[PDB]
Protein backbone atom coordinates (compact mmCIF):
# COMPACT_ATOMS: atom_id res chain seq x y z
CA UNK A 1 0.00 0.00 0.00
CA UNK A 2 1.05 3.61 0.88
CA UNK A 3 3.22 2.01 3.68
CA UNK A 4 6.86 0.83 3.62
CA UNK A 5 7.55 -2.30 5.79
CA UNK A 6 11.20 -2.23 7.03
CA UNK A 7 13.32 -5.06 5.47
CA UNK A 8 15.07 -6.22 8.71
CA UNK A 9 15.03 -9.44 10.81
CA UNK A 10 12.07 -8.02 12.87
CA UNK A 11 11.25 -9.90 16.16
CA UNK A 12 7.74 -11.57 16.35
CA UNK A 13 6.89 -9.06 19.17
CA UNK A 14 7.71 -6.03 16.94
CA UNK A 15 5.63 -4.16 14.32
CA UNK A 16 6.93 -1.20 12.23
CA UNK A 17 5.96 0.94 9.20
CA UNK A 18 7.05 4.17 7.47
CA UNK A 19 4.52 6.37 5.59
CA UNK A 20 4.78 7.80 2.06
CA UNK A 21 3.04 10.83 0.51
CA UNK A 22 0.38 8.51 -1.06
CA UNK A 23 -3.23 7.87 0.03
CA UNK A 24 -4.26 11.08 1.93
CA UNK A 25 -6.57 14.11 1.31
CA UNK A 26 -4.20 17.18 1.35
CA UNK A 27 -3.88 19.36 -1.80
CA UNK A 28 -0.52 20.32 -3.36
CA UNK A 29 2.10 21.01 -2.22
CA UNK A 30 1.12 18.78 0.81
CA UNK A 31 -0.24 16.12 -1.63
CA UNK A 32 -1.51 13.85 -0.16
CA UNK A 33 -0.73 11.97 3.14
CA UNK A 34 0.74 14.97 5.02
CA UNK A 35 1.11 14.08 8.79
CA UNK A 36 2.75 17.48 9.67
CA UNK A 37 0.64 20.02 11.69
CA UNK A 38 3.20 22.92 11.53
CA UNK A 39 3.95 23.21 7.75
CA UNK A 40 0.85 25.33 6.82
CA UNK A 41 -1.59 22.62 5.60
CA UNK A 42 -5.35 22.47 6.37
CA UNK A 43 -5.53 21.15 9.99
CA UNK A 44 -8.66 19.10 9.01
CA UNK A 45 -6.69 17.41 6.13
CA UNK A 46 -3.76 16.59 8.49
CA UNK A 47 -6.29 15.15 11.06
CA UNK A 48 -7.84 12.94 8.29
CA UNK A 49 -4.35 11.86 7.02
CA UNK A 50 -3.32 10.83 10.62
CA UNK A 51 -6.56 8.73 10.77
CA UNK A 52 -5.85 7.06 7.36
CA UNK A 53 -2.32 6.23 8.72
CA UNK A 54 -3.72 4.74 11.97
CA UNK A 55 -6.04 2.43 9.93
CA UNK A 56 -3.57 1.51 7.10
CA UNK A 57 -0.83 0.62 9.65
CA UNK A 58 -3.30 -1.23 11.97
CA UNK A 59 -1.68 0.74 14.87
CA UNK A 60 -2.94 -0.49 18.29
CA UNK A 61 -3.02 3.07 19.74
CA UNK A 62 -2.57 6.73 18.59
CA UNK A 63 1.08 7.59 17.72
CA UNK A 64 2.84 9.67 20.49
CA UNK A 65 3.83 12.73 18.36
CA UNK A 66 6.85 14.58 19.83
CA UNK A 67 7.53 18.36 19.93
CA UNK A 68 10.66 17.77 17.75
CA UNK A 69 13.35 20.52 18.15
CA UNK A 70 16.20 18.82 16.18
CA UNK A 71 17.98 17.92 19.48
CA UNK A 72 19.13 14.68 21.16
CA UNK A 73 16.43 14.31 23.93
CA UNK A 74 14.65 10.90 24.19
CA UNK A 75 11.08 10.61 25.69
CA UNK A 76 10.52 7.27 27.58
CA UNK A 77 6.83 6.48 26.75
CA UNK A 78 5.66 5.47 30.28
CA UNK A 79 2.01 6.66 29.69
CA UNK A 80 -0.19 9.57 28.45
CA UNK A 81 -0.86 12.34 29.40
CA UNK A 82 2.72 13.74 29.08
CA UNK A 83 3.88 17.03 30.75
CA UNK A 84 6.43 17.74 27.92
CA UNK A 85 7.03 15.81 24.65
CA UNK A 86 10.00 18.17 23.85
CA UNK A 87 12.17 15.41 22.26
CA UNK A 88 13.52 14.00 18.95
CA UNK A 89 13.25 10.27 19.87
CA UNK A 90 10.94 8.00 21.90
CA UNK A 91 11.61 4.66 23.66
CA UNK A 92 8.95 1.99 24.60
CA UNK A 93 8.95 -1.30 26.57
CA UNK A 94 5.11 -1.10 26.79
CA UNK A 95 3.00 -3.33 24.52
CA UNK A 96 0.51 -1.34 22.38
CA UNK A 97 2.43 2.01 22.68
CA UNK A 98 3.43 3.57 19.27
CA UNK A 99 6.82 5.37 18.90
CA UNK A 100 6.56 7.96 16.01
CA UNK A 101 9.11 10.38 14.36
CA UNK A 102 8.06 12.97 11.74
CA UNK A 103 10.39 13.60 8.70
CA UNK A 104 10.75 14.98 5.12
CA UNK A 105 14.54 14.51 4.55
CA UNK A 106 15.70 13.93 8.17
CA UNK A 107 16.77 10.29 8.86
CA UNK A 108 14.19 8.29 10.86
CA UNK A 109 15.92 5.41 12.72
CA UNK A 110 13.77 2.57 14.09
CA UNK A 111 15.31 0.34 16.80
CA UNK A 112 14.37 -2.90 18.62
CA UNK A 113 16.21 -5.57 20.66
CA UNK A 114 16.57 -9.24 19.45
CA UNK A 115 14.09 -10.33 22.21
CA UNK A 116 11.39 -7.98 20.78
CA UNK A 117 10.62 -6.41 24.22
CA UNK A 118 12.05 -2.84 23.63
CA UNK A 119 11.60 -0.39 20.67
CA UNK A 120 12.48 3.21 19.83
CA UNK A 121 12.21 5.79 17.01
CA UNK A 122 14.64 8.69 16.49
CA UNK A 123 14.39 11.87 14.39
CA UNK A 124 17.97 12.38 13.05
CA UNK A 125 18.15 15.55 11.00
CA UNK A 126 21.82 16.64 10.63
CA UNK A 127 21.55 18.85 13.80
CA UNK A 128 20.30 16.00 16.07
CA UNK A 129 22.38 13.27 14.31
CA UNK A 130 25.49 15.42 14.99
CA UNK A 131 24.36 16.13 18.61
CA UNK A 132 23.99 12.36 19.43
CA UNK A 133 20.23 11.59 19.16
CA UNK A 134 21.03 7.99 17.95
CA UNK A 135 23.53 7.35 20.81
CA UNK A 136 21.00 8.73 23.39
CA UNK A 137 18.22 6.49 21.94
CA UNK A 138 20.47 3.35 22.15
CA UNK A 139 21.48 4.34 25.76
CA UNK A 140 17.71 4.16 26.81
CA UNK A 141 17.67 0.35 26.00
CA UNK A 142 18.17 -2.07 28.93
CA UNK A 143 19.59 -4.57 26.37
CA UNK A 144 23.30 -4.25 25.38
CA UNK A 145 23.84 -2.66 21.90
CA UNK A 146 25.17 -6.07 20.61
CA UNK A 147 21.47 -7.21 20.86
CA UNK A 148 19.97 -4.02 19.25
CA UNK A 149 18.74 -3.83 15.60
CA UNK A 150 18.46 -0.48 13.72
CA UNK A 151 16.61 0.45 10.49
CA UNK A 152 17.67 3.54 8.48
CA UNK A 153 14.37 4.97 7.16
CA UNK A 154 13.83 7.13 4.05
CA UNK A 155 16.01 10.29 4.25
CA UNK A 156 17.78 12.70 1.89
CA UNK A 157 20.46 10.52 0.20
CA UNK A 158 24.05 11.52 -0.71
CA UNK A 159 23.04 12.27 -4.38
CA UNK A 160 20.96 15.23 -3.07
CA UNK A 161 22.10 16.35 0.44
CA UNK A 162 24.21 19.45 -0.42
CA UNK A 163 25.54 21.12 2.80
CA UNK A 164 27.96 24.03 3.51
CA UNK A 165 31.25 23.54 5.45
CA UNK A 166 29.35 24.64 8.63
CA UNK A 167 27.61 21.23 8.86
CA UNK A 168 30.90 19.34 8.06
CA UNK A 169 32.74 21.40 10.80
CA UNK A 170 29.98 20.45 13.35
CA UNK A 171 30.29 16.64 12.71
CA UNK A 172 34.17 16.64 12.56
CA UNK A 173 34.21 18.66 15.89
CA UNK A 174 32.50 15.60 17.55
CA UNK A 175 34.16 12.69 15.62
CA UNK A 176 36.78 13.61 12.92
CA UNK A 177 36.06 10.36 10.98
CA UNK A 178 32.73 12.05 9.90
CA UNK A 179 35.04 13.59 7.21
CA UNK A 180 34.52 10.37 5.09
CA UNK A 181 30.73 11.12 4.72
CA UNK A 182 31.28 14.67 3.14
CA UNK A 183 32.37 14.79 -0.56
CA UNK A 184 33.47 18.13 -2.19
CA UNK A 185 30.76 19.25 -4.71
CA UNK A 186 31.48 22.76 -6.14
CA UNK A 187 31.76 25.26 -3.21
CA UNK A 188 29.71 22.87 -0.98
CA UNK A 189 29.72 19.17 0.11
CA UNK A 190 27.41 16.20 -0.49
CA UNK A 191 26.70 14.63 2.95
CA UNK A 192 25.97 10.87 3.34
CA UNK A 193 23.44 10.87 6.26
CA UNK A 194 23.21 7.00 6.21
CA UNK A 195 27.06 6.81 6.53
CA UNK A 196 27.02 9.33 9.47
CA UNK A 197 24.24 7.23 11.15
CA UNK A 198 26.35 4.02 10.61
CA UNK A 199 29.33 5.84 12.28
CA UNK A 200 27.30 6.92 15.37
CA UNK A 201 25.59 3.47 15.67
CA UNK A 202 29.01 1.67 15.42
CA UNK A 203 30.35 4.15 18.06
CA UNK A 204 27.83 2.71 20.65
CA UNK A 205 28.23 -0.94 19.35
CA UNK A 206 25.04 -1.27 17.21
CA UNK A 207 26.29 -3.48 14.32
CA UNK A 208 23.03 -4.91 12.88
CA UNK A 209 21.93 -2.04 10.61
CA UNK A 210 19.28 -2.31 7.86
CA UNK A 211 17.66 0.02 5.31
CA UNK A 212 19.43 3.11 3.87
CA UNK A 213 18.27 2.33 0.27
CA UNK A 214 15.82 5.29 -0.24
CA UNK A 215 16.11 9.01 -1.12
CA UNK A 216 13.28 11.44 -0.10
CA UNK A 217 14.56 14.10 -2.58
CA UNK A 218 15.05 11.79 -5.65
CA UNK A 219 11.92 9.58 -5.12
CA UNK A 220 9.34 12.43 -5.44
CA UNK A 221 6.41 10.11 -6.39
CA UNK A 222 6.86 8.47 -2.88
CA UNK A 223 8.24 11.08 -0.43
CA UNK A 224 7.89 14.71 0.65
CA UNK A 225 11.26 16.51 0.74
CA UNK A 226 11.89 19.86 2.47
CA UNK A 227 15.06 20.28 0.30
CA UNK A 228 13.17 19.57 -3.00
CA UNK A 229 9.78 21.28 -2.31
CA UNK A 230 10.53 23.85 0.54
CA UNK A 231 6.74 24.14 1.30
CA UNK A 232 5.64 20.45 1.67
CA UNK A 233 4.23 17.68 3.93
CA UNK A 234 5.78 15.28 6.46
CA UNK A 235 5.99 11.46 6.55
CA UNK A 236 6.49 9.54 9.78
CA UNK A 237 8.11 6.29 10.86
CA UNK A 238 6.44 4.09 13.51
CA UNK A 239 7.39 1.12 15.69
CA UNK A 240 5.56 -0.65 18.57
CA UNK A 241 5.44 -3.90 20.59
CA UNK A 242 2.39 -5.91 19.32
C1 LIG B 1 18.43 17.76 8.69
C2 LIG B 1 17.68 17.65 7.41
O1 LIG B 1 17.83 16.66 6.68
N1 LIG B 1 16.82 18.66 7.16
C3 LIG B 1 16.48 19.72 8.09
C4 LIG B 1 17.31 20.97 7.79
O2 LIG B 1 17.07 21.35 6.47
P1 LIG B 1 18.25 21.54 5.39
O3 LIG B 1 17.62 21.33 4.05
O4 LIG B 1 19.44 20.74 5.79
O5 LIG B 1 18.56 23.12 5.50
P2 LIG B 1 19.54 23.98 6.44
O6 LIG B 1 19.65 23.28 7.75
O7 LIG B 1 19.08 25.40 6.45
O8 LIG B 1 20.92 23.89 5.62
C5 LIG B 1 21.89 22.87 5.99
C6 LIG B 1 23.15 23.07 5.19
O9 LIG B 1 22.88 22.81 3.79
C7 LIG B 1 23.22 23.93 3.03
N2 LIG B 1 22.29 24.02 1.90
C8 LIG B 1 20.94 24.16 2.10
C9 LIG B 1 20.07 24.24 1.09
C10 LIG B 1 20.55 24.16 -0.26
O10 LIG B 1 19.87 24.20 -1.29
N3 LIG B 1 21.92 24.01 -0.39
C11 LIG B 1 22.84 23.94 0.62
O11 LIG B 1 24.03 23.80 0.40
C12 LIG B 1 23.13 25.12 3.98
O12 LIG B 1 23.86 26.18 3.41
C13 LIG B 1 23.75 24.49 5.22
O13 LIG B 1 25.16 24.43 5.13
O14 LIG B 1 16.99 22.04 8.66
C14 LIG B 1 15.61 22.44 8.59
C15 LIG B 1 15.48 23.63 9.51
O15 LIG B 1 16.29 24.65 9.02
C16 LIG B 1 14.75 21.27 9.03
O16 LIG B 1 13.39 21.70 9.00
C17 LIG B 1 14.99 20.06 8.13
O17 LIG B 1 14.31 18.96 8.72
C18 LIG B 1 13.52 18.13 7.85
C19 LIG B 1 12.31 18.90 7.39
C20 LIG B 1 13.07 16.91 8.63
O18 LIG B 1 13.00 17.04 9.87
O19 LIG B 1 12.80 15.88 7.99
Residue numbers in the entry: 2 to 243
The authors write:
Based on the genetic observation that the absence of yfiH leads to the misincorporation of l-Ser instead of l-Ala into PG, our crystallographic results suggest that YfiH may prevent the incorporation of l-Ser by specifically hydrolyzing UDP–MurNAc–l-Ser (UMS) as the preferred substrate. The cocrystal structure, determined at a 1.86-Å resolution, shows that Gln69 indeed forms a hydrogen bond with the side chain hydroxyl of l-Ser of the substrate, whose carboxylic group forms a bidentate salt bridge with Arg235. Moreover, the measured specific activity of YfiH on UMS was more than 10-fold greater than on UMA. Removing the side chain of Arg235 significantly decreased the hydrolytic activity. The results show that the activity for UMS, but not for UMA, was significantly reduced in both the Q69A and Q69M mutants and that the activity for UMA was affected in the Q69A mutant. Overall, these results demonstrate that Gln69 is the specificity determinant residue.
YfiH is a PG-editing factor whose absence causes misincorporation of l-Ser instead of l-Ala into peptide stems, but its mechanistic function is unknown. Here, we report the crystal structures of substrate-bound and product-bound YfiH, showing that YfiH is a cytoplasmic amidase that controls the incorporation of the correct amino acid to the nucleotide precursors by preferentially cleaving the nucleotide precursor by-product UDP–MurNAc–l-Ser. Our results show that YfiH forms an extended L-shaped binding groove for the UDP-MurNAc-monopeptide and is a cytoplasmic amidase specific for hydrolyzing UDP–MurNAc–l-Ser, a noncanonical reaction by-product from the MurC reaction. Our results showing YfiH as an l-Ser-specific UDP-MurNAc-monopeptide amidase therefore uncover a bacterial control mechanism to ensure only the presence of the specific amino acid in the peptide assembly pathways by removing unwanted UDP-MurNAc-monopeptide byproducts from the MurC reactions.
